[PDB]
Each structure stands twice: as C-alpha cells, then as structure tokens.
C-alpha cells in the first residue's frame, strides 16, 4: 500500500479546485461530517458525488428547460445524461449550503455568471436533475464552474445542502467521524472566494485529490481497517507526527491535551504499517 | 533504488488536461496538425522532471498571483502562485501561467475584498511581459493581493492553443521547455484534447496537450528509472482487455502514433494506456 510521494502544499483540495493551503484538526470542529465530494475508500471506491474526472469538481453541465427560462436541466459533467434519483446530484456538483452559488458559465455563444440559491427549496433541486438560476439561463448548452459563494455563513462548508433527497439513501456518502478514543478528524484546508454574508473559510476536505486518484488507480488490498502514517520532513526524514488513515477514506490524529492543531503543509505522509482500530496515536 | 516505470491505471476520460484545468474530452492525432509545438505547460519527463512553466501544484494551472504596482495602476507585479518571489529570467513566466497566444486572456480575479474579471492582451508586447515579472491588465488592477484563474479567451484565432506567446524572452533559452515533434518516420504526435471557453474572434478549439495531468503527477511522485528512451504502450479496453492500438511514449514526455494511410484520427477516450515494453527510437509502430 502506498501514498503519492508529494508534499501537502503540492496537493489539491477535493471539494473545490484549489491548492491545499492549510492542515487543521480541532475538538471544536463538528464531530461528524457528510461531505459528498472528496470521498473515496482506500480501496478506490468513490462515494457520493465524487467525480471520476477530478476537473469536474465544482463543475456541472446544464441546458435551459425552454426559451427564456431560469430553469436548467442538468447533465453529467461529461455531457452524458443525468439520471434523476440516481444520486444526490450530478458528479462533481458542489456540496455547500447556507449560501448562493455563483458559477462562471460558458457556452458556444456566451461566457458569463449565473447564481443558484442553495437556500431555496424551489430552486435548488439537483437530485431531480434541474436547478433554477437567479437570472435567466443562457440559450444553449453550457459548462459551469464554481467561482465564489454569495452570502454564506460559517456553516457553509460544513453542512451539505438539501439536495431534495433522503441523506440516508445508499447513493449518499455516509457520515464520517473520528472513531478512536480521543481522536479528531484531520482536515485539508483552503480558502474560497466569497461575497457578503459571513466568513465561511476555511473549506475542509477529508482527502487530497491526488490520494483519491491514486486509490482508484491502485485498487490496493487492505490488510487492515487502519493504515498507520508518519508525517515526515522530506529534507531530513524526521517525523513531525503520526496519523491513522481509516479504510473508508479519512485521517484522524491525537490532539492529546490540546483542543486544536494547525499543521505545516511542507511535509509528506508515508505509509508505515497496517494497524488496528484500537491503535493509540501519539499526541500531536 | 529507483522504482520501475509505471502509469496510473485510469481511463483517459477520467484524466485531466495539463494546459488548462479541464477534463480531457478527446484524443486526436493528425498530419495536418503543426509538426512541432513548444508548450510550456504540461511538460514533464518520464523520470519526473518538470519543464517550462509546469506547476508543482496542479491547481495552479492557468492561475497566477499578482499585486498592483501602485495605487490606480493597471500594472500588476507577478509572484509565484504560492507567493514566493518570481525571479525574472528563471522561467518564461511564473509556474502555471497560461501558454496561449493570439488572443486576450480573461481571468477570474479574487482578493480579500473583491471578485471580478481582469483581461490581459497577449498580442500586446507592452502589456504581456510575464518574463519581466509583471503584466498590464486592460483595466485597473484590484487594490490588494489577488489570485487569478483563467476564465476564457477573448478574440482568439485558430493558432491560439498551438503557438506559445511572446513572453518577452528568448524561447531558445534553457528556462524554456524545448520544441517537440514526432521523431519516428511517419509518426505523428498524439494530443489530449478539451474545449476552452472563448468569446468572439475565431474558434481556437480543441486545446491540445502532450500529457495528462495525472501522468505528470505520477511521474513526479515515482521518479522512475527508464530502461530505454522510449516506452511502448498499448491502448486497451479495460472491460475486455483487448488492444485497440499501440503508441510510443518518449522519455522527454510525449506520445506518438502511426496513422498509417490516414491523415487524421479521433480516438476513443474510454480505454487505458498500459506499459508494454522498452523500445528504441527506431521501433516501427503498427498503424492505428
Ligand atoms: Zn443515461
Ligand atoms: Zn428536470
Ligand atoms: Zn470550463
Ligand atoms: Zn505538538
Ligand atoms: Zn525571491
Ligand atoms: Zn464583471
Ligand atoms: Zn492564421
Ligand atoms: Zn500514482
């Protein structure tokens, strides 16, 4: 079993297309999260809306329902049809809430911005295969990229929106929490552009995109439920701290007596050995 | 101690473009494509040596970090996309900076206080000077430090994605990624394609690149030793295991195919490239 031999500050975020800027763990972070993007088992099984093609992250493909409408019918980001009820949303669709989403929108004839209100039950219904922009949709087939958040809150990057679908369905990526005693989830962080509202940043994710991609490529056999990792200084080889990588695709650390930790991103995670659920991590 | 050479086990339609942050949509080769190209992004040796402006962080592709030179100015001083200083002459441009020409480049720009659009005229010798460590927007720069990512091209041409711009620097300099052409007789370069947003002018699409981003990333991680200058590859149907065609993967980071009697080919992207064997420059490819 292996990880890519790359420093964290060369890795990319997995819920938005941005480089990973920070690494954080905290007892004041939510104990459980249910991100739909950036979700993959160590054996390379993608979960939720995690796109098979990484560049589809935060993107979608839409077509106006009828001339002059604000309503767009959703496809998969590879222009293949989106089957309603098959998933919370088309693959790569943003899993943010408590805000409006402003997308850059590009068709054969136009480039501009459109905004969808994720607070609106009427407009935000991706599981049904269509959403309603705040403005009139472009006349033709377009590709959209998430550009910024409008009027977000502190909860925007931590709580998934109402997809107009039951979150306990098998099509959803399941909730994640640190199972080990005293353990807390390790999050990869970046900042996302936003206008008005309150500061949503930082944006957390469980896994780097490169790790997810690697897992899918390797399809490694797991000899245990938990992989032990050392965070190592690439120049000296010295260990800064150890973490456990659980089979369902997340990292935890032992904060020990501490309630918080902001970790340097110039190190490299290395696979040490296979350990068990009960392995007790040395405090950060 | 160097590991053997390997490729990621992923179909092409799950791979990402390496000159713009887009999924690879098509795979094409043609005798009517330019015989040589000198892309500065998406350049990497099989042993994991990055070339040109190819960013160590993939998310920096088509991005840059800038600061306005003085209050009210259109001129922005360029940094590296991780804010380390950009020393002029070290490279054609800061890492990840777009290598497109014959157009204007419209970026989405985000600072602590603003999100908007800024445009640089790449046809302008005075305004497009990234090698000197600054460029001049069409509009007044944001008041504070910003990050920009490529949004669309304005008024491009058919050559926009094929010819690199004038960085205001000697393109034969050692800091440039060298020109690339199919070395074998009758061979043509295999290009990975996607579409890029554009307004007005003439259609520049599709946008070519030599290597998938994931391959480049994989090469950097592995730092593999090569047993020869050329790796033979089979493009295989992952479901059935059958070979669709074979291609040559050269050490300096590009693929070629034999189109045979054909002058053009658009190839399916649902297959997977598999490492076959080590061959030489003179290996003769079975026609696609
Ligand atoms: Zn279908
Ligand atoms: Zn519908
Ligand atoms: Zn796009
Ligand atoms: Zn400590
Ligand atoms: Zn410096
Ligand atoms: Zn604007
Ligand atoms: Zn011409
Ligand atoms: Zn890999």
SS3 track for B102-152: CCEEEEEEEECCCEEEEEEECCCCCCCCHHHCEEEECCCCCCCCEEEEEEE
CB A75 within 8 A of CB A91: no
Q: How many angstroms separate the CA atoms of B243 and B223, rounded?
A: 27
CA distances from B140 to B17, B74, B116, B121 (A): 31, 4, 12, 14
Six-digit token pair at B70? 């003085």
Q: How many angstroms separate the CA atoms of B123 and B81, rounded?
A: 23
- In a shared domain, residues B202 and B106: no
- In a shared domain, residues B209 and B100: no
CATH number of the domain that residue A171 is part of: 2.40.510.10
CB atoms within 10 A of CB A141: 16
Chain A: closest CA distance from residue B58 (Å): 7
The backbone torsions φ and ψ at residue B132, rounded to the nearest 5 degrees and listed phi first, read: -90, -5
Calculate how far, in angstroms, residue B148's C-alpha sits from the geometric centre of ligand 8. Answer: 28
Closest of B43, B11, B14 to residue B220, by C-alpha: B43
Cβ contacts (< 8 Å) between A266 and chain B: which residues?
A: none
CA distances from B155 to A244, A264, B103, B200 (A): 51, 43, 5, 5
Six-digit token pair at B59? 């998310």
Cβ contacts from A onto B, under 8 A: 82
Closest of A93, A97, A84 to residue A128, by C-alpha: A84
- In a shared domain, residues A108 and A188: no
Contact A54 B199 (CB under 8 A): no
- In a shared domain, residues A34 and A122: no
- In a shared domain, residues A262 and A190: yes
Domain boundary among A150, A185, A216: A150
Element (H, E) at B88: none
- The β-bridge partners of A273 are A228
Contact B115 A195 (CB under 8 A): yes
- In a shared domain, residues A82 and A205: no
B106 at A interface, C-beta within 8 A = yes
Breaks in chain A (C–N beyond 2.5 Å) sit after: none
Contact B16 A216 (CB under 8 A): no
Domain that holds residue A1: 1-56+151-284
A55: nearest CB among B22, B60, B223: B22
Q: How many angstroms separate the CA atoms of B112 and B92, rounded?
A: 28
CA distances from B22 to B37, B105, B147 (A): 20, 16, 19
Mutate to test the interface with A, among B4, B14, B54, B106 (most CBs of A within 10 A): B14
- In a shared domain, residues B198 and B109: no
Q: How many angstroms separate the CA atoms of A255 and A253, rounded?
A: 6
Domains held by chain B: number: 2
CA distances from A22 to A13, B57, B255 (A): 10, 14, 36
Contact A217 B23 (CB under 8 A): no
- In a shared domain, residues A110 and A90: yes
How many residues in chain B? 288
Does the annotation place A13 within a ligand binding site? Answer: no
Give, as residue ranges, everything with CB less than 5 Å from ion ligand 3.
Answer: A 143
Q: How many angstroms separate the CA atoms of A192 and A200, rounded?
A: 8
CA distances from A152 to A117, A194, A195, B139 (A): 11, 7, 8, 28
CB atoms within 10 A of CB B42: 27
- In a shared domain, residues B194 and B205: yes
- In a shared domain, residues B11 and B65: no
Domain boundary among A150, A175, A194: A150
CATH number of the domain that residue B66 is part of: 2.40.30.120
Contact A193 B115 (CB under 8 A): yes
B247 at A interface, C-beta within 8 A = no
Chain B: closest CA distance from residue A217 (Å): 4
Tell me the technique behind this structure. X-ray
Please name the residue that has the structure tokens 């592995």: B222
CB A230 within 8 A of CB A211: no
A121 at B interface, C-beta within 8 A = no
The backbone torsions φ and ψ at residue A124, rounded to the nearest 5 degrees and listed phi first, read: -100, 85
Resolution of the determined structure in angstroms stands at: 2.3
Per DSSP, the three-state class of B14 is helix
Q: How many angstroms separate the CA atoms of B191 and B211, rounded?
A: 8
Six-digit token pair at B211? 């290597």
CB A60 within 8 A of CB A51: no
Instruction: Find, in chain B, the residue whose alpha carbon is nearest to that of A220.
Output: B9
Domain boundary among A150, A181, A198: A150
- In a shared domain, residues A40 and A97: no
| CB proximity list for A87: less than 8 A, separation 6 or greater | A48, A49, A127, A171
Per DSSP, the three-state class of B68 is strand
Q: How many angstroms separate the CA atoms of B10 and B23, rounded?
A: 13
CB atoms within 10 A of CB A280: 12
Ligand closest to CA B119: 6
- In a shared domain, residues A224 and A121: no
Mutate to test the interface with A, among B21, B55, B59 (most CBs of A within 10 A): B59
DSSP label at residue A245: E
Six-digit token pair at B1? 């101690």
Please return the burial class of B189, using the count of CB atoms within 10 Å of its CB with bins 0-12, 13-18 and 19+: buried
């Amino acid at each position: 079993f292996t990880l890519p031999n790359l420093p964290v500050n060369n890795l990319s975020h997995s819920r938005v297309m941005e480089p990973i800027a920070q690494m954080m763990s905290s007892r004041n972070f939510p104990a459980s999260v249910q991100f739909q993007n950036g979700r993959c088992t160590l054996s390379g099984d993608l979960l939720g809306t995690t796109p098979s093609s990484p560049s589809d992250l935060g993107a979608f493909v839409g077509l106006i329902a009828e001339p002059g409408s604000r309503v767009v019918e959703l496809s998969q980001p590879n222009q293949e049809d989106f089957h309603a009820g098959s998933a919370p949303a088309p693959f790569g669709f943003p899993d943010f809430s408590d805000c409006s989403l402003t997308f850059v929108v590009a068709s054969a004839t136009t480039v501009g911005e459109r905004t969808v209100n994720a607070r609106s039950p009427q407009n935000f219904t991706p599981a049904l295969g269509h959403i309603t922009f705040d403005e009139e949709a472009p006349a033709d087939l377009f590709r959209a990229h998430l550009r910024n958040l409008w009027d977000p809150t502190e909860h925007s990057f931590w709580r998934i929106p109402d997809y107009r679908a039951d979150v306990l369905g098998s099509e959803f990526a399941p909730s994640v929490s640190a199972p080990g005693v005293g353990e807390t989830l390790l999050f990869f962080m970046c900042n996302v552009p936003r206008l008005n509202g309150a500061n949503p940043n930082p944006c957390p994710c469980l896994l780097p995109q490169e790790w997810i991609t690697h897992f899918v490529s390797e399809r490694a056999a797991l000899q245990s439920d938990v992989a032990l990792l050392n965070y190592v200084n690439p120049n000296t080889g010295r260990v800064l701290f150890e973490a456990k990588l659980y089979a369902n695709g997340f990292l935890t650390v032992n904060l020990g007596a501490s309630d918080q930790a902001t970790l340097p991103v110039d190190g490299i995670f290395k696979f040490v050995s296979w350990v068990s659920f009960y392995y007790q991590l040395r405090p950060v």
